[PDB]
C-alpha cells in the first residue's frame, strides 16, 4: 500500500 | 530482442551522446521508467533536466516511443519542454526542460494549499489537457507527481511515458496504464477508454491537493483498484474544509460513467476556476520558500 508506482498492461 | 529494439530506437532518435556538452549529473528523482537528473551546459552554466531510462528496466518498451511522439509533435505552455532524445548505451536519455521548482507531491504531503492555489493549479492542468485531447493524446498519468513546477509559480504538465493517442480509426485504447489509486473507474474495468481518463484522474490529484493523499491509500493498489471500480465515487475526507464551488467543480469530475464526467474545454468555463490565482500564489508553497 502507499504505492506511487505506475502498472503498463 | 534488447539489441533489436536499441536499433529502432536509433533511427528515431538524434544521434550522438549529450555527455559531451552536459556536466555534473546529479540525480534529483525516479519513475518506474527510470530516472531524473540534472545536469549543466558546459558552454552556459545552465541547467536541464535528462530523464534515463534503460531499455530493458520496462514494463512495456514500445511506451518510450511516446517520450519521442510527444516532444516532435505536442508542445505548450504548460507542457514540460523536450529539447532532445539520444541512445546512450542501453538507456534512452531524454534532455529536458529544468523544472526547478519540483514535483507538486512534495507541496501535497507537507503543507496545505488554498483554494486559490488549487484553481491555479487545475486551470493550468486543464489549459494543457484541452490541447493534448483536442489532438487525439490522453497523458494516462495524471496526478500530483507528474505536475512540475517553476521557481516563479508556472505549472506544467510532465511525464508522457504512458500515453496514447486516439482517432477517427482508434476512437478507444483498451490498455492497462496508469497509478492504481489514480486510474479511472472505466479502465480498471477494463472497458475501451478515451480522455475521459484524465480528467478522472484530475478529480484524484484533487483530493490529493485537499487531503494530502488519494483515497484508498492505504490499501494495497489491487484492493484500492477494487474499491474504485466498484463503490460510488471517492469522497474527500475533509469535504467539511472545501467550498461549495470546489466541491461543485470536483463532482463534474468523478463522474463514473465516462460520457457524463465533464471534458477539460468545458472544465475551463466552470466559477471555480475563477479563483485561481497567478504563479506567485504558488511561490511559498515551494520547499525552498515554507
Redesign the interface.
Not at chain 2, 490498455?175 to 492504481?180: A, Q
Not at chain 2, 491509500?217 to 493498489?221: H, I
Given at each position: 500500500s502507499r504505492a506511487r508506482y505506475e502498472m503498463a498492461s | 530482442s534488447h539489441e533489436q529494439f536499441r536499433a529502432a530506437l536509433q533511427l528515431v532518435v538524434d544521434p550522438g551522446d549529450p555527455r559531451s556538452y552536459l556536466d555534473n549529473f546529479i540525480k534529483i528523482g525516479e519513475?518506474?521508467?527510470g530516472i531524473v537528473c540534472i545536469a549543466t551546459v558546459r558552454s552556459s552554466g545552465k541547467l536541464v533536466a535528462v530523464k534515463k531510462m534503460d531499455l530493458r528496466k520496462?514494463?512495456?518498451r514500445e511506451?518510450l516511443f511516446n517520450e519521442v511522439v510527444i516532444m516532435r509533435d505536442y508542445q505548450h505552455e504548460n507542457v514540460v519542454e523536450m529539447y532532445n532524445s539520444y541512445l546512450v548505451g542501453d538507456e534512452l536519455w531524454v534532455v529536458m526542460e529544468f523544472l526547478e521548482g519540483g514535483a507538486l507531491?512534495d507541496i501535497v504531503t507537507h503543507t496545505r494549499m488554498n483554494e486559490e492555489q488549487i484553481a491555479a493549479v487545475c486551470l493550468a492542468v486543464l489549459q494543457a489537457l484541452s490541447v493534448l485531447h483536442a489532438q487525439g493524446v490522453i497523458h494516462r498519468?495524471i496526478?500530483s507527481?507528474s505536475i512540475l513546477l517553476t521557481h516563479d509559480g508556472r505549472v506544467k504538465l510532465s511525464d508522457f511515458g504512458?500515453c496514447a493517442q486516439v482517432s477517427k480509426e482508434v476512437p478507444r485504447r483498451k490498455?492497462?496504464?496508469?497509478?492504481?489509486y489514480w486510474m479511472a473507474p472505466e479502465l480498471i474495468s477494463r472497458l475501451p477508454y478515451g480522455p475521459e481518463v484524465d480528467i478522472w484522474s484530475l478529480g484524484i490529484m484533487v483530493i490529493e491537493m485537499v487531503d494530502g493523499?488519494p483515497p484508498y491509500?492505504?490499501?494495497?493498489?489491487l484492493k484500492?483498484m477494487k474499491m474504485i471500480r466498484d463503490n460510488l465515487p471517492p469522497r474527500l475526507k475533509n469535504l467539511h474544509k472545501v467550498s461549495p464551488s470546489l466541491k461543485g467543480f470536483l463532482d463534474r469530475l468523478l463522474v463514473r460513467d465516462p460520457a457524463q464526467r465533464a471534458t477539460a474545454a468545458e472544465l475551463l468555463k466552470h466559477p471555480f476556476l475563477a479563483k485561481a490565482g497567478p504563479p506567485a500564489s504558488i511561490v511559498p508553497l515551494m520547499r525552498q520558500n515554507r
Open positions: - | 519513475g518506474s521508467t520496462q514494463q512495456r511506451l507531491t498519468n496526478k507527481d504512458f490498455e492497462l496504464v496508469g497509478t492504481p493523499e491509500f492505504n490499501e494495497p493498489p484500492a
